[PDB]
Amino acid sequence: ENIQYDFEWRPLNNYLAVQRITPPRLPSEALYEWIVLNGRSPLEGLSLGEHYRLSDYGVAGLALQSAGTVGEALQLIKTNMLLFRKDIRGIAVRRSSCDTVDVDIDLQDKPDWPQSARLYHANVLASAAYAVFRDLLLGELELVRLRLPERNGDVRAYEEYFRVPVYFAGAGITFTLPEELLEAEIATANSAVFQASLALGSKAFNTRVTREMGGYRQRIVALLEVLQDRYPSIAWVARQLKVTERTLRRRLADEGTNYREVLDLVRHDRARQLLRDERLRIEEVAERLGYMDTSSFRHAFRRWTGQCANDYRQA
Template identity: 30%
Template sequence: MAELAAPAVRDWDFPRGTASVLLMLAFAEDHGVPAEKLLPGTPREALTGPDRQVDARQELAVVRAVAAHTGGDDIALELGRRYRVTTFGIFGFACISSPTMRDAMLFALRYLDLSFTFCIPHVELDEEGISLVLDDSRVPADVSRFLVLRDLAAIHTVMRDLLPGISPRGLEFRHPAPSSAKSYMDTFGVEPEFDAERHRASFDPAFLTMPLPQANEQTVALCAAQCDALVARRRERSGISQLVRERLVRLGGVDAGMDEIARQLTVSPRTLRRRLTDAGTGYRQLVDEVRQTLAEEMLDTGALSVEDVALRLGYAEASSFIYAFKRWTGTTPAAYARRSAPRARPGR
């Protein structure tokens, strides 16, 4: 089986525009959940604007909040259906202007870091057809099922925006079957198989070469140039965030203070604060992100107690760590460790 093209990114931790966060806030409000519960302390105006961006972990926090306050397969699929090709801005405009579905898929894989996906898509081809496989191996376990469903429903909805007649001929999910698969049928038009080896949607290969109704090669070329510029800007702006993360990781998640990190980066604390704000994040958020990542990795091993993890991350008391971890993930460290135990077994 051959892969159509390698996705531009292999992990979900890339900077994003704010359209997805804004969409989720509106979706939650439609279900009676105020935006303040999902993104406390951040006014919606701060997310509005074509050049605004957020760190992937900020968006993941909103996903967690949506799942916690609404939850369930039906909600995840309904949320995914809200993502239309116009949600993706210039990236979506380029896809809809592509000559064929194959060209649109190649473009999407090439500029995947302009999307909002957490599960990395792989498009595989063989004599039987096209397989769209979602890799959720790096997605946090507590939201992996929710994000698999949201992301695949979003991809399917966008594909139908590009080519209204397209539909999968097969659908598989690794997770167990829900009590009812009606929302799956309503979303994809196909009855899925559960407890499968992979998350996969299969399509007739004839769809690859079908011309798209709004194809325009000149428009695609123009959009590609704008996407190149957008990717370059995002990577440049997010560079300072990565530098701060690297130094915090070297410290094992222990918070040395922004003044010390600024000194290591040979900038003033004021300059560091401004550059992080420009990148759509802040020092405190990065400390939390690094601590959460390291905590999850240590808990995944099953070798350390909650108290040991708290001590290694620089917490004076385990209770402070437990409170912080629940704020990050919506669950306690002990519950997370129990949930992750199967993943930590040999042969993982």
């Protein structure tokens, strides 16, 4: 029983309301087609693209908003699991040796649509993607360049709209960004909301984003880092990643690790700052690192470094 919520339905109808137009698997798919095929100019696609709000992308959009950096937001975008994914064949992010990054949007074919409708369509996706970039990823900096699909036409109205150089060539859409943007902070970053929001995504979304973010080890490390002083069971972690414990163990084993080793890496790292703090007793360091008593911590710490905790604190 596959039932999807139709997030695109409202913004489509908002466009129709604004333009005073009356309309005759998801209901939005047929409506979108009708709007596109009845467009009187490809430029109208730019207006329709404006009607997609970040909130229209649902919990995936919340993850984007709360991501730590622009680079991390682009990892989520690369999963191709946002609104237009049926119409997008793939999204690539390519580093250049030219201090720029290309975000390439590859579009699915529309062989039954005429050439004007296909240009209209590309403008909708470009305008909507631009809105996301603008509100969230650009901030102060600007787009270097925008490439839209080849046609015989003037670029003026597009440079008017996007306020950056634009040209027509090839297939799909490419946004060129300054490379330094990737490490820039997202203004609404919130790592707790980000991790929580990923966990609310679908099984398929979770598998894909885990891959794009660097794999299961990295995913678990990021999750534990947000949980500043909690050390969850593998059961709880598997739940957050939308996988069974068995699957998680296996995928960790493929990356050549295991859950206990990942947990202890985070604990060891955290213990570095705790055993320098002169105000804490070893007892308090143990409790903070999730151990049930001091002796179990001492044995673990010994196992990590090969040195005793009190001797380490001095040296």
